[PDB]
Design a protein around this ligand. Structure first.
Ligand SMILES: NC(=O)c1ccc[n+]([C@@H]2O[C@H](COP(=O)([O-])OP(=O)(O)OC[C@H]3O[C@@H](n4cnc5c(N)ncnc54)[C@H](O)[C@@H]3O)[C@@H](O)[C@H]2O)c1
Ligand SMILES: NC(=O)c1ccc[n+]([C@@H]2O[C@H](COP(=O)([O-])OP(=O)(O)OC[C@H]3O[C@@H](n4cnc5c(N)ncnc54)[C@H](O)[C@@H]3O)[C@@H](O)[C@H]2O)c1
Ligand SMILES: NC(=O)c1ccc[n+]([C@@H]2O[C@H](COP(=O)([O-])OP(=O)(O)OC[C@H]3O[C@@H](n4cnc5c(N)ncnc54)[C@H](O)[C@@H]3O)[C@@H](O)[C@H]2O)c1
Ligand SMILES: NC(=O)c1ccc[n+]([C@@H]2O[C@H](COP(=O)([O-])OP(=O)(O)OC[C@H]3O[C@@H](n4cnc5c(N)ncnc54)[C@H](O)[C@@H]3O)[C@@H](O)[C@H]2O)c1
Ligand SMILES: [Zn+2]
Ligand SMILES: [Zn+2]
Ligand SMILES: [Zn+2]
Ligand SMILES: [Zn+2]
Ligand SMILES: [Zn+2]
Ligand SMILES: [Zn+2]
Ligand SMILES: [Zn+2]
Ligand SMILES: [Zn+2]
Lengths: 362, 362, 362, 362
């Protein structure tokens, strides 16, 4: 086995602290990865604060990128030295995995959120296997189906975030909603998820692209990214503004705040036959409201989306190619921090000055 | 012009009373119909009680069938003597009508619910043009696009209800949801709309077909129509029953009670990637709730449906053909009343002994 | 009635000649248009040469734009003075028109190709009603459903071609094929139809955009319009080139030459699960070949497309909006000629120096 | 290792002969199956006659059913004693396998047709691994992803054929074409594949169900299975008959003869917007013809289909459930033979008296 450094979250709300640990060699179709850098997402934070019961203590991080250092014996599609992006955790044998919907895997809450493996064994010597990677560390063990080979022609430290927040936002528009050329789209919330979606609606051809938030600097960045219209929902009624701008209501929408009352607003601002995709979440158990009659008479659709609905092994490489061509500049949401500044990376994202932090590890 | 007898609804909640009135000859693409019989629907009742502002006084009825007596000059697809079913009111020139979605016509609330025509002119000499027919009368004026030619080989008095409640229920399953072979389906509410949907899921191939209600005799009829499972939601927790029966949650569902708290139940009982279509309505302005997280993690879809989403000129004849073949026995929901018993037809549907009344007029 | 000048095609292969004729006022839902300019298409030429039996003599032209001068009495969506684009001819009452497929109207060969109206009456005083417009004239009579209102903010002489060749090419990609973001597309033939499709695949997000032709200047223009790759099929094996460029075969394709042997090439160059749309036509009765096994084992799709499959009343305005935004520069295929140079406009398109001619009439 | 009996095909066209061989224990995610019975398909025959280059000598059979006798160590979804159906061979890691299209796996010709494994190793001690099973033997080795658990409540000897011919025919209608309620369908060729499709169109709700063949007894069985119309294409022009019966052309079709000239007939008999799925194959390299203009003006679709396009792990159990309910009586195509009568089973299928043979082995 091997010794490594990893950031541990010791208890409800505790700060990340660096600790010395050990990781074993890979078996079956497992992969041993040398981590270069790992993105930081809202979800790592909500788990520390236990608004989700991942058992503590544990090693979090779910947006890793690195270099393969060792493959197991049944590994056939990856070799030592490949550059990879580590995405969420799926079984690939159930009904949803066999029909091209891994995000809906009947083992989704157990492979990413349990805190362990299939038996209760941990691969780190302390709970691990978080989103099947536990990547706030120098070394990570993943599975072949969640390890995505990417090109060596792009700096590898910048691509971790594609395994979660960027695919989630871009995917909601491309795979789930399917925005069409010449249509109107709006993103509720202008964080890294929303702005990823805004960049993808640009790629789909939409003619009207709107962003709604409460922090002014996030609204200025949206506009610089190509939002045709920006709206401050603290100072303006957003429903009324969206309806006048789109002459009746928007064709496509994204809810990324997780706020219930903003979510009703989002269903109300849809036009006839409009669709709203739901990616943000409130506390376990919260409900939201919608006006019945307005949804039934408008023929409106309300739909739930996990990780953008695609197949990551297919979609992740498509986003890297769109970026190399100059059509999807997600590198503009990023700011790099040192490993010993990981607690400061959390703070900046919560106050809104940093859209997408990336913990440099190697 | 011509003299006729029609049932008038004089004020909030008043009883239908027979009155002598006059109807003019048809113009442009209008059609003059001799009514044989007209179905009765919940919606005629909710308009009398003004939970919807159709201006009173007026002639209601929106499920008519009859014989063409006179066509206007630009009428090209119908001739004197054809047997017809009079469906809802659409413009056929807007964006939704031109793309095959007439139920979503941008003039839907004005052609059926205004109480008049495009200018304010009434064709009956008193508000008319209700669902573009006003068919509780011996004579009705409709438009060519809402007048559907059907075969003379089936008694014409039995087909009126296809212009609304039967198409609504059958259409939600066939056109909107699209139930697939070997799947699980549930109808919340076992009235004429629900039982029409249940009969259509049988046609689509579903292997598990469930019906939930509170009146026992409606649950016995469902089962005799081929429900694999029936559930009384006064005596049993319906969510728990649906989840155990379908091993995790139903693939497809229909909400036809209009009750908000039953509607949350319906979203909760869906399985992974399930879909629930909404056709029943509460009072103008009411909202309903759903659990966020459960909808987002299950990839659930919630969708609004008006009149089954098809094109009636295409779908209505398809239902008559399925019926003649013996595959869609909607005649089992019907009971005939005389024109002078129209007030009693309302009472029986509200207490649940009569599923679908048909006022015989000729 | 009114006197006008129109170009007549007197016999198999005869030259257009200007003649003095008369046009009547509009009835029912008919529209009287003052023509500003009319595009020229390959199809006008093939009808003169009678590879299609439109009865001669007659007034052709099927890509008109103008100003409304008079509306009939049942016209409700257009007024005197609107600027319009005159598209093909559809009934709007049959099964295909009622489901959002007017291009497939069961009266398609009779409304555009018969040479007359529903009865045999001609509106021009000599066969007319060609594509329901006969627009190589100072005045044209159309129907409300084929007359598309557009903005007064764009010169009206440039938009006629949107009623046929530009919608055909752009529509095959947007409505029929549905090209997806990051995919590979190829257009066989780089004339106005192909290059319209190439511009639309740019709008849909495709990462690889290929054009194949035999005239070098058309290949240079494609590349300047944003083709990633161009291929001369006289000098290079195009199948082999397309397969190496897309690492196995293209995802989406368009056949616009009408040449059978090029069409087999097009099915062979598709990759697994690829799709090829057919818009070009050979002589009535010609067949084409495909390799069976390759289509069955690759899961390939071969599909027929008329006028881009959309709804023109919806799609035409979407293209004008994409153009105003700077995302669909179809004005680069155009060259203007005087009315008395109409015979020279035919010659230039047949030799390939002119992509899309526009006969200026007003 | 273990000793067994298996039928070997020694050379171009040789007869099956029983031989004594040996099979090894399973590794990784491999499965050791005790075979009860194996269906016989046209494809076993075409490989013996080498119209496809599977290297001889080898053990064929590709429609097996049996009992699990041993699982490898990474096997998680199957246990010793389960009853299974062995379907075709897929990788489950490529782009097509990850998006829910295993039939289109980029390793399809190598996993079923190579004659060996990934390296050239054979598991039988002589070429094996045929359709990843080689099931004309008492023991078979398969992979976990091609081994489908089914219920112990149905005799296991009857279900092998579901791993190929029955799924192919039923799947073309349910997954690939998607026949809709009240539509018209036709199957060209009334063998086990066609009649499986005919039984599935019954399940999808079609109102008109046609079967075309040249052997009279196969046409009598179709009709007894519920074909509304039967046609002998030796004695009647089938195009003309199909067009008059469906008033213009059929909505959906299946080509299962592999005959090119019958395949053009099939595209000609489609009605506006019709679709024809291609499952039968001619010799490697053969082409077929279609009329261009008729396909382009009708908006017709021609599509290639392998093994019914579904996901077998999902679809196979759906067919067994439809059968138990009494809605898909595929047991009527079957006749059982002894293992030592396997050469006679080939003869009877080629002369058409036996629709689907099943070699009883245990
Ligand atoms: N469903 C999935 O697969 C999935 C995966 C990724 C992220 N998540 C969730 O998606 C969300 C977005 O993540 P992110 O990285 O973009 O977070 P973020 O903090 O970067 O972005 C959210 C934005 O919402 C804005 N906001 C908050 N309250 C608001 C209000 N009342 N009105 C307007 N704007 C408001 C904030 O200003 C912020 O810019 C979080 O809920 C995250 O946990 C879901
Ligand atoms: N969206 C549309 O196009 C459209 C058109 C038709 C009907 N409507 C609406 O659809 C509904 C159905 O019409 P219908 O003719 O079938 O009415 P109905 O009265 O015949 O049927 C509704 C059924 O709901 C049941 N129900 C009521 N409360 C219940 C509860 N708490 N739990 C269980 N069951 C309960 C009743 O027992 C009854 O059988 C009405 O709301 C009607 O106005 C909508
Ligand atoms: N289906 C419909 O609705 C519809 C409507 C519009 C146009 N049409 C047909 O579509 C076609 C395209 O019209 P267009 O205006 O673009 O015509 P065009 O003459 O401008 O373009 C066709 C191109 O094909 C190229 N070509 C011809 N033979 C070739 C070969 N062997 N190899 C490579 N390239 C070759 C020519 O160089 C030319 O550039 C014509 O057949 C027209 O009649 C169909
Ligand atoms: N694409 C796939 O995944 C796949 C898998 C299974 C079967 N196959 C192929 O599908 C086909 C069907 O297999 P099957 O078991 O049903 O074979 P079969 O022999 O049982 O059936 C084919 C039928 O075609 C009929 N036929 C032959 N020539 C005819 C003609 N000219 N006119 C009319 N009828 C004619 C025969 O009478 C026979 O009944 C074969 O080509 C087989 O190899 C394809
Ligand atoms: Zn899974
Ligand atoms: Zn995340
Ligand atoms: Zn309308
Ligand atoms: Zn009604
Ligand atoms: Zn039509
Ligand atoms: Zn044209
Ligand atoms: Zn594969
Ligand atoms: Zn087979």
């Amino acid at each position: 086995l091997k010794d490594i450094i990893a950031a541990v979250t010791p208890c409800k709300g505790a700060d990340f602290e660096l600790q010395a640990l050990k990781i074993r060699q890979p078996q079956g179709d497992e992969v041993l990865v040398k981590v270069v850098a790992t993105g930081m997402c809202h979800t790592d934070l909500i788990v520390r604060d236990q608004k989700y019961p991942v058992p503590l203590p544990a090693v979090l991080g779910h947006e890793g990128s690195g270099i393969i250092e060792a493959i197991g014996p049944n590994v056939t599609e990856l070799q030592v030295g490949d550059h990879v992006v580590l995405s969420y955790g799926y079984c690939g044998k159930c009904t949803q995995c066999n029909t091209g919907n891994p995000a809906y895997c009947s083992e989704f809450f157990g492979r990413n959120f349990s805190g362990a493996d299939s038996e209760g064994n941990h691969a780190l010597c302390v709970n691990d296997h978080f989103f099947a990677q536990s990547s706030f560390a120098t070394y990570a063990l993943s599975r072949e189906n969640n390890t995505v080979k990417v090109t060596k022609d792009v700096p590898i430290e910048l691509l971790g975030p594609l395994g979660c927040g960027i695919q989630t936002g871009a995917g909601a528009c491309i795979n789930a909603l399917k925005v069409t050329p010449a249509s109107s789209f709006v993103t509720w919330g202008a964080g890294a998820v929303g702005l990823s979606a805004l960049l993808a609606a640009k790629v789909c051809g939409a003619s009207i692209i709107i962003a709604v938030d409460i922090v002014e600097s996030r609204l200025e960045l949206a506009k610089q990214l190509g939002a045709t219209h920006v709206i401050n929902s603290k100072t303006q009624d957003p429903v009324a503004a969206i309806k006048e701008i789109t002459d009746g209501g928007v064709n496509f929408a994204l809810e990324s705040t997780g706020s219930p009352e903003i979510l009703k607003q989002g269903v109300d601002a849809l036009g006839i036959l409009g669709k709203i995709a739901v990616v943000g979440a409130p506390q376990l158990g919260t409900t939201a409201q919608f006006d019945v009659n307005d949804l039934l008479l408008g023929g409106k659709t309300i739909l739930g989306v996990v990780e953008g609905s695609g197949s990551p092994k297919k979609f992740i490489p498509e986003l890297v190619r769109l970026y190399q061509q100059g059509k999807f500049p997600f590198d503009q949401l990023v700011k790099f921090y040192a490993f010993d500044e990981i607690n400061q990376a959390a703070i900046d994202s919560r106050k809104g000055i940093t859209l997408k932090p990336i913990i440099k590890i190697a």
